[PDB]
Amino acid sequence: MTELCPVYAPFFGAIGCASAIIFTSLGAAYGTAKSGVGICATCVLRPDLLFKNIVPVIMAGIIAIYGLVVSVLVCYSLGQKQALYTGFIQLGAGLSVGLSGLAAGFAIGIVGDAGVRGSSQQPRLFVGMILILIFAEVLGLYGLIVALLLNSRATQDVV
Amino acid sequence: ASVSEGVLRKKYTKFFQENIKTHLDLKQALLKEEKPETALLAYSLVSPSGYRGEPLTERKILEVVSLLDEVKVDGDTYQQLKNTFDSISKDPRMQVSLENQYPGKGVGLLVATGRELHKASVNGDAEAYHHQLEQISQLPGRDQRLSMPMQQTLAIGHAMLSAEGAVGATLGMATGYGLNNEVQDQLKQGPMSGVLPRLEISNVKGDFTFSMQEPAAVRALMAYLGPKEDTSMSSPQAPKEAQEMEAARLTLKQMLGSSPNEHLVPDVDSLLKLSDEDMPSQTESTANGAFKKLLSEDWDWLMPAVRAMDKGEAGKINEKLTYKLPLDAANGRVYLDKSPNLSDAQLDALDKLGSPSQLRLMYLAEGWI
Amino acid sequence: MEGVYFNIDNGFIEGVVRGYRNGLLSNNQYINLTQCDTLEDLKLQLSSTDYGNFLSSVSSESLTTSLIQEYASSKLYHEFNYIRDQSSGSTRKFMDYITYGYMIDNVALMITGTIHDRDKGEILQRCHPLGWFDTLPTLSVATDLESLYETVLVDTPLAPYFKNCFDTAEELDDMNIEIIRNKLYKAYLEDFYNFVTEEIPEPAKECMQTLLGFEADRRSINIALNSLQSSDIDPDLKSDLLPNIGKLYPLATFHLAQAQDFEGVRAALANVYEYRGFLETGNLEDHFYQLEMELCRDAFTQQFAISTVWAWMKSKEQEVRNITWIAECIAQNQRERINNYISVY
């Protein structure tokens, strides 16, 4: 327990590991629940567009894998005698992917239910739905890029 | 107007009032009236094996089934049923039908729960298939005497298997009798099913007797009525004992509604498929796929399609089953229409079949096609 | 409690409407009106009440039974418009929701009168001046519904209530317009119940919930008793005309949607305690008017509540029905059933 490596330093990395998988699961949960209401209300009428309409739920399920691959990399850099700088970096890497995935999941849910309700009246709207959902999907990938760029600097030149 | 039933147990309340708990002198207390040509006939359901090695000599069901057979209004249809059944219990083709449907006479928690929920869902769909099959025989031209109790037995067995699967999955998930008895007596209420004769069997093994209110005997009876008659067994050139059993088999198969040249072999096996002689005629498999597409997409598209198909209107099916439902989209409610998208190659095949035989629709609801 | 924040913007309104309540005719004043010989005697006897000097500047010989209820209604409607001009916030929304139910009746009356080829000016009279909405006389064109909603009804406040109404695409007869009216009134009663539940405070909340429940129950019973007549309606097509609120909803509206004869309606109301004394009677609407007046009298005991604005408005409209019934018997010498007015105050 030095001044640059205290004992409360794994607190920040431990709640940065938890905050990555928590806030991507809430985003994926809203993006699955909001979208799955509009799928179950639309495949009553059109039962053969069911596998076509499943694609916003798959897009929401990718967001939780981003938080999973951030949480398993922060966890392998945790230690008892680590620095505070490492704990700050692991907080930043958790919160970036967590809140970016939360916002991306809100967007994917709200776009996806309206898209599957509108694509079953006009079949030429299903490609526009995928085009909007790709723009909503990359908002979590930016937080994944930031979380992977922070974690690369957690133990570079750290004493 | 083929059959009618009642469920009030207070009209003939003399034979069920006191403790009449013995088949001995049960026919002696059965006269009790001006019943002479209508008293010994009702006893004939329990006369062969109702005393000769009988447990308890009665029960609550076995005596209530005898006085719900009021036959005072007319006694011709059930007399022909008593002559037709038990004249069919002589051939070995009925004997092997009562052997295939009878015996000799961690992650594993997820796997077991998956087995139980599969049992629940599969035995729950077939109950609905049979509930929309007892309103097909409500239509004019059908029968309600042999069809109605035969497919009110199978729905009860499927409801029991569905409840058994759900109780098993719940008892397995919450850990890793009184609940199955609570669903058993509950399905014993409501309407009252008509009687069918008893089908006693006396072969070299012994004197067996099945019930026809149990689903195994019902499920073993319709497999017997499946195949068409061959070049033998109906000609007047081997007239040994065939004009009393094959005539009875054909009058039951026609009483269902099946033609004498329809094959209808069961297909549930792990073996190789129906080879070529029991394989359908390529305008039947297309029609069977059309019926399976009608069952799989709505809970009310089989009875109006059969009603239209009996009128010869089987090309107008796409525009008589269409109906509109609302969809609250992002631009207001739109009222789209659900319709059965039958292709033309399966819309003319339903013109090849004139009327659906009830025996085909009961293999459809049980899963044998 | 409720009196702490009520009088910040509704105390003047409360006092004025309680003073309006105090001018309701009691039982002795209807007896004095019943004893009148001619119609000028009715004018003198009404001059000693809070109507006083409202049939001034008419005549002694231009006095007619129609003119008496025209002026006695115009007084009521000017009083309602005076109260609504002094309101703001939530009370203004409450009174606009009172107005929408008369707007629906004006819509149905105008659409029905357009079909029978009659004058637009005679449908614009006898057309209840409280639910007006300036673009109303434009409904005398283009006799199908899709050319009505897409031109003039989207701007009205009745526009959210046309959701369950687009299952036809043809012209309109007397049956289709009544189906449209029943569907609009269903959506209106459900939306106004939902406004009362989320936004009105408590002693007025429960009063307006039981008053709107009574209105929904009466609509349900009259739709059930006007559908067993010479028509043929699918029972799931009739459950779309019965409102989803009230004390006979979750069980008895299932049975009223399937009643095939008059004994199917008596069997459905036999389970509800406040009813089933109604279908063996003289008149059937004289039970509903009596029970509505006993409900409106009970709403005047709650002191810090805007349900009073409802309870006055339905009581005074009963009063204008009573005077007309006396004036139809004095002008026609039909004193045999003259004491069949409905008086609770």
Curated annotation (Swiss-Prot), chain A:
InterPro entries: ATPase_proteolipid_c-like_dom, ATPase_proteolipid_csu, ATPase_proteolipid_su_C_euk, F/V-ATP_Csub_sf. It is a multi-pass membrane protein. It holds the Pfam family ATP-synt_C. GO terms for cellular component: fungal-type vacuole membrane; Golgi membrane; membrane; proton-transporting V-type ATPase complex; vacuolar proton-transporting V-type ATPase complex; vacuolar proton-transporting V-type ATPase, V0 domain. GO terms for biological process: endocytosis; endosomal lumen acidification; Golgi lumen acidification; intracellular copper ion homeostasis; intracellular iron ion homeostasis; protein targeting to vacuole; proton transmembrane transport; vacuolar acidification. Its main location: membrane. Keywords: Hydrogen ion transport, Ion transport, Membrane, Transmembrane, Transmembrane helix, Transport, Vacuole. It is found in: Vacuole membrane. Residues 32-53, 113-124 are cytoplasmic. Gene3D superfamilies: lithium bound rotor ring of v- atpase. V-ATPase is a heteromultimeric enzyme composed of a peripheral catalytic V1 complex (components A to H) attached to an integral membrane V0 proton pore complex (components: a, c, c', c'', d, e, f and VOA1). The decameric c-ring forms the proton-conducting pore, and is composed of eight proteolipid subunits c, one subunit c' and one subunit c''. Belongs to the V-ATPase proteolipid subunit family. Present with 8450 molecules/cell in log phase SD medium. Proton-conducting pore forming subunit of the V0 complex of vacuolar(H+)-ATPase (V-ATPase), a multisubunit enzyme composed of a peripheral complex (V1) that hydrolyzes ATP and a membrane integral complex (V0) that translocates protons. V-ATPase is responsible for acidifying and maintaining the pH of intracellular compartments. PANTHER family: V-TYPE PROTON ATPASE PROTEOLIPID SUBUNIT. This is V-type proton ATPase subunit c. It comes from Saccharomyces cerevisiae (strain ATCC 204508 / S288c) (Baker's yeast).
UniProtKB/Swiss-Prot annotation, chain C:
Transmembrane segments: none annotated. It is found in: Vacuole membrane. It comes from the Eukaryota. InterPro entries: ATPase_csu/dsu_sf, ATPase_V0-cplx_csu/dsu, ATPase_V0-cplx_dsu, V-type_ATPase_csu/dsu, V-type_ATPase_csu/dsu_dom_3. One of its GO terms (molecular function) is proton-transporting ATPase activity, rotational mechanism. The modification N-acetylmethionine is found at M1. SUPFAM superfamilies: V-type ATP synthase subunit C. Keywords: Acetylation, Hydrogen ion transport, Ion transport, Membrane, Transport, Vacuole. Its main location: membrane. It holds the Pfam family vATP-synt_AC39. It is a peripheral membrane protein. One of its GO terms (biological process) is vacuolar transport. One of its GO terms (cellular component) is proton-transporting V-type ATPase complex. V-ATPase is a heteromultimeric enzyme composed of a peripheral catalytic V1 complex (components A to H) attached to an integral membrane V0 proton pore complex (components: a, c, c', c'', d, e, f and VOA1). Subunit of the V0 complex of vacuolar(H+)-ATPase (V-ATPase), a multisubunit enzyme composed of a peripheral complex (V1) that hydrolyzes ATP and a membrane integral complex (V0) that translocates protons. V-ATPase is responsible for acidifying and maintaining the pH of intracellular compartments. This subunit is a non-integral membrane component of the membrane pore domain and is required for proper assembly of the V0 sector. Might be involved in the regulated assembly of V1 subunits onto the membrane sector or alternatively may prevent the passage of protons through V0 pores. Belongs to the V-ATPase V0D/AC39 subunit family. PANTHER family: VACUOLAR ATP SYNTHASE SUBUNIT AC39. Present with 1630 molecules/cell in log phase SD medium. This is V-type proton ATPase subunit d. It comes from Saccharomyces cerevisiae (strain ATCC 204508 / S288c). The gene is VMA6.
